[model samples]
Target: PLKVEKFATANRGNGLRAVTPLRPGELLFRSDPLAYTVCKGSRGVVCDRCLLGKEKLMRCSQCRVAKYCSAKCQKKAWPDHKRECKCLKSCKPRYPPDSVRLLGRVVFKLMDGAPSESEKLYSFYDLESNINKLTEDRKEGLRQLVMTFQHFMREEIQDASQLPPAFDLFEAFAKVICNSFTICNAEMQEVGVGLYPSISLLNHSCDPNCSIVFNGPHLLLRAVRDIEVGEELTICYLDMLMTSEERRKQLRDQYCFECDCFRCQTQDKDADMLTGDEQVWKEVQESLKKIEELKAHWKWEQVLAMCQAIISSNSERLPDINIYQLKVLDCAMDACINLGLLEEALFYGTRTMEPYRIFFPGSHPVRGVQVMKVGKLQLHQGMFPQAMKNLRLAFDIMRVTHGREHSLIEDLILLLEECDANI
Candidate 1:
């Protein structure tokens, strides 16, 4: 996928560069996780194996900790769950936090001989701990977490002989887990967390050339724009919507590095606007947060009304392309669609494409889904010709991004055939 090259910079240790001229939307790489866990918060709400949301779920017979949508999912999840199940059952209803669970998974992999696997893509030792660079406060926080993880592991591993060295294991693993893992979902929905050692090699940039996308548990590093051969590939580790000062402060505090990327060096114009009308930006952030809650509740009317009000009131303050407004438009589209207002759905759905295109790579799954939404709206309006064209394009894109066997592709193909017959 990418050739890793050593760099001269102390902070930017390893950089991933394009070996060839990668076109826009081309996949740079797909990496499987070293270890992952379905977040503890999502236990019953989503399948432990597939990470899909579900209504009716079955609990594991032994641990009774994991919930699966079906027997197939339960079986698929057994490799990770079997190790933790007995420990969880012994603990009886006391569950570790997401970070602990992730740590436990990593430890289990090591115990199962991940370190000894000659063909593995990355070893546990290869991970950057950044322990020496952690702030005094962060060090103190990690000290506490170390104790917590020790207790969690003690219950599982009866023989202390099996445990790794106590001195650096917890603290070092904590740092690597903190800096290396990414949210399983491409966007910030936090569906799950995964450790992609290969993908983690790319350093941060406020303005990034590559975007990460998820095809189920697999992480696809896709180029958002064309990259020249030898150009270093980068991804944004922080919120791109933050002001330069905010971004820099966060990078310093969290990742222990200061960004001097092109966007940070020139101070992107969009970020400059963040300094204007702090109150207005505050309102925008607040509204965006509230809309997220409303969306979860399926309160389409409230979401519709609130997003519209936010857009209208802050029209001048809002950027032409932004996550907040993009989310608002998406919610508005769904709200209108659920209400059977095809024309209004089309209105809001059309508005989302521009921002999504700017933010996501062209082959992104969200782009396919967004275009599918417009196609559905057109189909509702009996515009078969327009609907079929968009549907066909979306199908082709999704076949690559989502895979041909995805449930979404089946639904899309069904709609395409309907469009064909109607035309």
Candidate 2:
């Protein structure tokens, strides 16, 4: 339950310029949550990974309160767990419930962690190749789709019996998530209770101006890109947790967040926003429109071609690219189609996961989405038997993620049916 607000400042050029107007890469205000929650409490709250009911799980030897799938997992994660465990044990709570929650969630994960560096956690993915590929209109369409899906989420979905129907909506939503990316540092130690709500609403950009790094579980959104006042502050939903598809689905089913940034709009082929020089800052607005158009196409090859063109236009104007850079990779996988570039696609694809442990640790659906994508690529390449193994695992992850009726589950089911049919 975090409320989003924008703060105005003049150009100091340190954090975010005070006021000469900020650009897409402009810095915005970041709030260190006053609290957080690491090992969730409540009667049924249990280990998300092992599903070892709290009763079935064991506590960290160091922090008696922290539970894990097993002592093995706990020990394995000890390097990261140590700091947070110690911090939480010794923490002196001085704030209100919510404020303290933010503190715990933010700091708990830091005990076994390290301080963040100056690198732009979300900037690495913002490549020219990423921006030139989508048209602003297409990106807008995606934004709308995401928005519409979010509207449904805001309404609250309590229809348990409407399984298959719910899944259809969810499956379509998952596809969007599948193609997106979230950037993060592999080195940052997750601290405190670990999830921040305001940080979660950030929309994706291949090249975001603002950057984020975690302080324990608390996500600090800082300006790597300059910002102008009155501009809509954006971040990647794919930033900390969930895959693009899972992220989309979550927005649709939970908090009701929708993404319609310059990135999502480039999918439209007919949109005029796409056919021009997009490198100059002056052309940025135009370029974003084009990227949105490109996002609409089902064929990644077309999108890849578009991306290549944009990359050449100007690397500087690249839209915010983080882990979502996979959208570019997704096109490559399709364009190659077993041309023996599977490894290459996957190689690049793996790079997008740089933030896995930093923003979201543990066996989360965010991590699982990539596993499924890699597994699917292997399967489609006729690496079948292996594909089956991978697909099964991916299905398991999605089951935990999207739930029994999640559209992703249906897609998984279809993939299986197709596998059996072909066999």
Candidate 2 weakest ten by summed lDDT:
121-130
lDDT of each: 0.69, 0.40
Candidate 1 residue-wise lDDT, 12-88, digit = tens: 86667777887655666766667777765566766777777666889897988888879998997787778788777
User: After superposing candidate 1, which stretches have Cα over 4 Å from the reference?
Assistant: 1-11, 90-94, 113-119, 158-160, 165-167, 177-180, 183-189, 271-278, 290-325, 331-347, 357-369, 380-423
Q: Please give, for residues 16-45, the per-residue lDDT of candidate 2 as tens digits.
A: 223345432222444333222333222123
Q: Give stretches of model 2 more than 4 Å off.
A: 1-20, 23-27, 39-63, 67-209, 224-226, 239-248, 265-423
Lowest-sum lDDT 10-residue window in model 1: 113-122
**How do all models score by TM-score?**
0.78, 0.28
Give the distance in Å from residue 347's predicted Cα in candidate 1 to where it truly belongs: 4.7
Candidate 2: RMSD to truth: 20.2
